[PDB]
Design a protein around this ligand. Structure first.
Ligand SMILES: [Cl-]
Ligand SMILES: [Cl-]
Ligand SMILES: [Cl-]
Lengths: 4, 284
């Protein structure tokens, strides 16, 4: 998963 | 200087102190605030910087990792010591005033309660948009060696307060949990009033542990909204104690403790607004  | 030395040097030395008058009456422009924000290094740890076998299964996001020097290490009871969480300094660099962490995943819920137990945490601040697994029970649940029960729950427009008991063996402890919604990730609340009410609620919370412990603050990734909340609290403390605030210096200190704290120029701008409101609300 990626948040930025 | 290596890239990393440059980063650490910036974070230790940058500052923009403002008198409360300057903050309220003559603040830097939005463009000035954006340029100032964009100058601040992230201080993100790379997966290569982290040599903790098995840690990836316990991270919500592969790009958001706890800085090793300040990571919270889990003791042996509850095989590893890993949780995606960092100790955060508070006012004047006071150690371990907060733990900033991600919202627990189903497989890290026991880890989260072990942290709460081990660190003698009496207060949890959760920032979310009610629009991550519930790690607290509707009435009672068991998570690893911990039994959690709801003692009280109260609703106000700004947040929900739950009063919880955590039991490990024959020992029972109290934990206050505050859930503040209507804060979307990568964004800000529409107004600052509720946020300051939340800060006041936190300020008003009694200590209920055997020794003072960190306040746990969390959101999905544990950096943006989490960083904004903590920076707001420290900023209010500066304004109240000193009649000035250094918001740049607050953000830099936060980033030394956990990479990426406060995500966007808009959140940084909103921090200025929120603190100007706090200043205006101060007694006298
Ligand atoms: Cl520092
Ligand atoms: Cl403090
Ligand atoms: Cl407002």
């Amino acid at each position: 998963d990626e948040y930025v | 200087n290596t890239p990393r030395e440059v980063t650490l040097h910036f974070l230790r030395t940058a500052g923009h102190p403002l008198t409360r008058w300057a903050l309220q009456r003559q603040p830097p422009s939005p463009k000035q605030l954006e340029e100032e924000f964009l100058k601040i290094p992230s201080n993100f740890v790379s997966p290569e910087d982290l040599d903790i076998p098995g840690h990836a299964s316990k991270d919500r996001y592969k790009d958001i990792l706890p800085n090793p020097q300040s990571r919270v290490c889990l003791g042996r009871a509850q095989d590893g010591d890993y949780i995606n969480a960092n100790y955060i300094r508070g006012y004047d660099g006071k150690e371990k005033v907060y733990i900033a962490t991600q919202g627990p995943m189903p497989n890290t819920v026991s880890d989260f309660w072990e942290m709460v137990w081990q660190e003698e945490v009496s207060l949890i601040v959760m920032l979310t948009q009610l629009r991550c697994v519930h790690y607290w029970p509707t009435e009672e649940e068991t998570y690893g060696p911990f039994q959690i029960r709801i003692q009280d729950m109260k609703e106000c427009p700004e947040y929900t307060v739950r009063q919880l008991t955590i039991q490990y063996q024959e020992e029972r402890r109290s934990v206050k949990h505050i859930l503040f919604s209507a804060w979307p990730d990568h964004q800000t609340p529409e107004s600052a009033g509720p946020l300051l009410r939340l800060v006041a609620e936190v300020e008003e919370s009694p200590e209920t542990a055997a020794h003072p412990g960190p306040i746990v603050v969390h959101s999905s990734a544990g950096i943006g909204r989490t960083g904004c909340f903590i920076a707001t609290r420290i900023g209010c403390q500066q304004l109240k104690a000193r009649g000035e605030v250094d918001i740049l210096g607050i953000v830099c200190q936060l980033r030394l403790d956990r990479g990426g704290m406060i995500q966007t120029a808009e959140q940084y701008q909103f921090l200025h607004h929120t603190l100007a409101l706090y200043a205006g609300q101060l007694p006298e």
